[PDB]
Write a protein that binds this DNA or RNA. Structure first.
Lengths: 82, 369, 73
RNA sequence: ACCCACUCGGCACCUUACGAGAAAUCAAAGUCUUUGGGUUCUGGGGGGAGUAUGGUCGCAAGGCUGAAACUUAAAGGAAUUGACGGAAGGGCACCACCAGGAGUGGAGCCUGCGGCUUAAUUUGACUCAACACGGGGAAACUCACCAGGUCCAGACACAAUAAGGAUUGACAGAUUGAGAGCUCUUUCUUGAUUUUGUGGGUGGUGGUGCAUGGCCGUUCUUAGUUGGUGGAGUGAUUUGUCUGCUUAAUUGCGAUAACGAACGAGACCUUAACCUACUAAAUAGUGGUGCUAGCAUUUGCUGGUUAUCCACUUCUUAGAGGGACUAUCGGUUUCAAGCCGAUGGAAGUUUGAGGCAAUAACAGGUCUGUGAUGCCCUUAGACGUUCUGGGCCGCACGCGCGCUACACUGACGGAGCCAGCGAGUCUAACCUUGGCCGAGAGGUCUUGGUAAUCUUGUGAAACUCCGUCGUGCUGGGGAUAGAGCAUUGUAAUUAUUGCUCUUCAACGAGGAAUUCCUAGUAAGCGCAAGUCAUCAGCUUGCGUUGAUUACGUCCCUGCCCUUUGUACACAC
RNA sequence: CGCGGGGUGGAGCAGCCCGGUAGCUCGUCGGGCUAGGAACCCGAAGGUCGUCGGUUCAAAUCCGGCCCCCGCAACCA
RNA sequence: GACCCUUAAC
């Protein structure tokens, strides 16, 4: 019996989804110096959850540090005002 | 399959392609060829009254087989199976040589090697004076040891239950090593009296087995030729006695069979007496009748006397089929017989082809009309 | 072609020829007298006045009545 | 040493040519049935066989000479036509490749094929040119297959129980579900088919598509086929029908033993779309009716009783001069038919696409469409005719056509909503429109058009602002079970079908292999019709969103033509 | 009746610089090629290693028994 | 470069 598989390895991703003070103030102090900020940018650089990325993005535009340019779904394009 | 794919007639083509495929799948059901071979048949048998089915018959023969066969024909070919069924006589072959001995069995077709061993022979050269005879007699004694070992091994593999099963013993070999074995006293009395012939083969071992069979092909068949004359010989010698135990005709000899005695019953291979099973509907009466070979093809007697009612033709059973149901009551040997011999030829043409020995001299004509 | 055994019994049952019995309709021997009707039928007007009430033993059979015939004496 | 003219001798050299030849061909292979110049050698069907019992020469290898038995109906020669060629020259085709695209093959499932269950798994179709094909979903019939009381329509002899009444409709009984007892210790209201040796039958999805008709499937998805007369050859045949020039064309231009024709191609027929005038009803925006829901008292954004209409028709509607013929032009070709570019017009390699579509053929398929057709121990137990229950609706396995996925370009939740083919009503409840509270489904009522005003101004899936999980065998999971709710169906238990609820099952850009494809095509998506008793993963049509090269090649498997070889001839 | 080697899938070989709980070829099977065979391509299965008993550091390779394949020695009076 | 074969079954 043969099942015709490959079964590659995995990286064991550890995207945290409930954020504590250590992550909350890390992203707050690191949202500068980021020319392009998005949902995938947050999770692939600060290793936060996917829903956190969009929720945090809404938080950063509610108070306002990162100025959005394109508010489209499925692709969020925010820049930082200077 | 490919060569059948270009048969011009579609009816032939589809049948053969399907038959080949159905053979293939049943062969796929077998992981390996079983011992005694595998006999396969595919096609469409023809009975009466039209209810069709495609048959697929594979079975392992009860006895070892040697023939191979593959034939696609408008009718099934069973002649190999019938020959392998009829021929049941077993002949043991002893191939004795200075290099070693072989014991083999020969059915109608198959060849089996029961047990073979090799022996290191001593040196014929003695090249001595004060000890040549001592070594020569010593060398002869080792030959006697090898002759006896071959002789006792014959009993172990051929004799079973204090009875010899092989029909005859063919002693094959070369350089006088089979003559001494046959004439040796340690060789079993029954096996020595069953020695068929001495055969001079050019090789030992298995090859000598092949050549021994080739040189004894006609003698093996002649064994049944001999027992056939012996079976009827006691029958005819008791006739030459001018004694009262003389019988003739199936109508009478079947009455003798039903009465008793009958040490041996004689039944022809191709019986001329065809009998129809009868059963009346009205009176609910069951009986037994007997018929003649010549007065049944065309005779105006084929009507109903007891009830005067029309009877449809019934499928007819042979007399051998009915007599085989209880052939053990009289203990008589079921022996298929021939008509080739001149003494046998007049027995068939003058005495009905059925005979038996009465225990004592008893009168039949004393109570007659 | 495989087989055909006809397990069901021999059922060649071609109809009979109505073998003649003795003469029938033995009503009575009534010479020089009143002639009445046999097998008096029901009060239902739908009776054809020609059928016979086959009343053998406390059971009545009527041709006009298809399946039901119930009266009380 | 060259040039002309002779000549003798020699090597040779241009033809189906008077003549010869079976022809190929031949300056001899002629002067040969109109048979004779001289002379040497050889052969007498194929094979066995150039094989010696022999002889002779030779160192040997072998040479020379040279049978018979036996066995054969042909072997062989030269042409012709075709087929074939890992033969050549041209031209082509995405059922061929090249640049590639979407894939299939890999997973689950749906179909269709291939043995067996001593009980049927009905069957035809085995490359293209079968295998979602038989228009082939099967509550059940359809149906042939299996198990099962088994009722039958003689045309002109009547061989007789023919009024010795030859015969039907029916209680029940272990065996006929039944207002289907066929005879059967019980035969009743009309009654004139009579019953079997036996020589015409009226039926059969019984078998023969190697007996047939008709119809449909390879090439013409691409340019092939054929007479008459003339020419060549003894003839089979050939020329016409062909070198070159271009062919999504035996299409034309043209050398021309051919001329003139016929079929095929083309032409022809069907669609999109500008005529704005005897192609439109308010069956479609209407140009002014009547007013209502917002702001400006200044100039919009939609709904409309029902025969007053008024200078009414350019969008799905298709007749009459219509229109696009390589316009014209630019270049290239014996400027010849014609490759290729430049503005042009609803559109330009014949506009796109399709239908129609030759002559041979195939033992191609269909006797299971046919009441279109010979045979079958056939005419009161049957293969005919049906009735009940079973079943291609059965599983160790392999294959073909398919559907849904393996997800962030993506799933789900909203929300916005936009096509086109098309169908729908008598011994009618089909086409689910609204007022059935009902709530997937369908009973209430049908107010509903000779189906633009009713389903449907198709008012749909796909698609598309904004938000829910974020890369996991996860919200990519009814694939597989269990539980329940409904309608069509004298009847669904081997889910009929739809609906609600539980768990992840394989599956993680699928191996060798393989298929289709050149434009609004492919590909994504879904809808109407066929089938249909509601509801079909198939087909046919379609319509929505809309990809990489198109100056292509023959090496990539096959077509067309020609030349050439053949010991092939249903023909590699 | 002495002395030596060897026994692993149907067949032939890998544990012999002491250990990957058994792998590599042929054969077989499945699929694909092709109008079927072959050849070719892609995959799959197959032996607890002749049997029994010993150290228990994955021990059965290396130890001791029986069977089987064989091989050499079988002399000088 | 490699490329073998092909019905007894009307």
């Amino acid at each position: 019996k043969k099942k015709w598989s490959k079964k590659s390895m995995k990286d064991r991703a550890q995207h945290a989804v409930i954020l504590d003070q250590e992550k909350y103030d890390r992203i707050l102090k690191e949202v500068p110096t980021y020319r392009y900020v998005s949902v995938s940018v947050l999770v692939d650089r600060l290793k936060i959850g996917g829903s956190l990325a969009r929720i945090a993005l809404r938080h950063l535009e509610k108070e306002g540090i990162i100025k959005p340019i394109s508010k489209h779904s499925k692709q969020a394009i925010y820049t930082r005002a200077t | 399959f490919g060569t059948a794919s270009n048969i011009k007639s579609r009816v032939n083509r589809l049948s053969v392609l399907g038959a080949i495929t159905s053979v293939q799948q049943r062969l796929k059901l077998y992981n390996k060829v079983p011992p005694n071979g595998l006999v396969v048949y595919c096609g469409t048998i023809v009975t009466e009254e039209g209810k069709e089915k495609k048959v697929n018959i594979d079975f392992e023969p009860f006895k070892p087989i040697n023939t191979s066969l593959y034939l696609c024909d408008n009718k099934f070919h069973t002649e190999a199976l019938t020959a392998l069924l009829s021929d049941d006589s077993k002949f043991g072959f002893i191939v004795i040589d200075g290099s070693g001995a072989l014991f083999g069995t020969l059915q109608g077709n198959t060849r089996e090697v029961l047990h073979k061993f090799t022996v290191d022979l001593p040196k014929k050269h003695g090249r001595a004076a004060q000890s040549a005879l001592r070594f020569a007699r010593l060398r002869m004694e080792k030959r006697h040891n090898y002759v006896r070992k071959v002789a006792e091994t014959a009993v172990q593999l051929f004799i079973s239950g204090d009875k010899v099963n092989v029909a005859g013993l063919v002693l094959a070999g070369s350089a006088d090593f089979k003559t001494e074995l046959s004439q040796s006293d340690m060789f079993d009395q029954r096996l020595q009296s069953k020695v068929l012939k001495l055969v001079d083969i050019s090789y030992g071992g298995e090859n000598g087995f092949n050549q021994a069979i080739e040189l004894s092909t006609e003698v093996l068949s002649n064994v049944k030729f001999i027992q056939e004359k012996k079976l009827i010989g006691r029958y005819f010698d008791e006739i030459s006695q001018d004694t009262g135990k003389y019988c003739f005709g199936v109508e009478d000899t079947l009455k003798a069979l039903e009465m008793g005695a009958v040490e041996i019953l004689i039944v022809y291979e191709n019986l001329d007496i065809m009998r129809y099973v009868l059963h009346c509907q009205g009176t609910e009466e069951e009986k037994i009748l007997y018929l003649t070979p010549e007065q049944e093809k065309d005779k105006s007697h084929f009507t109903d006397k007891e009830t005067g009612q029309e009877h449809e033709l019934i499928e007819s059973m042979p007399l051998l089929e009915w007599f085989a149901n209880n052939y053990k009551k009289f203990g008589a040997t079921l022996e298929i017989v021939t008509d080739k011999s001149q003494e046998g030829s007049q027995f068939v043409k003058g005495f009905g082809g059925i005979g038996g020995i009465l225990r004592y001299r008893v009168d039949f004509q004393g109570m007659e009309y | 072609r495989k087989k055909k055994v006809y397990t069901t019994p021999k059922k060649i049952k071609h109809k009979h020829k109505k073998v003649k019995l003795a003469v029938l309709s033995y009503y009575k021997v009534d010479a020089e007298g009143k002639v009445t009707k046999l097998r008096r039928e029901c009060s239902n007007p739908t009776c054809g006045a020609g059928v016979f009430l086959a009343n053998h033993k406390d059971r009545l059979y009527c041709g006009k009545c298809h399946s039901v015939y119930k009266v009380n004496a």
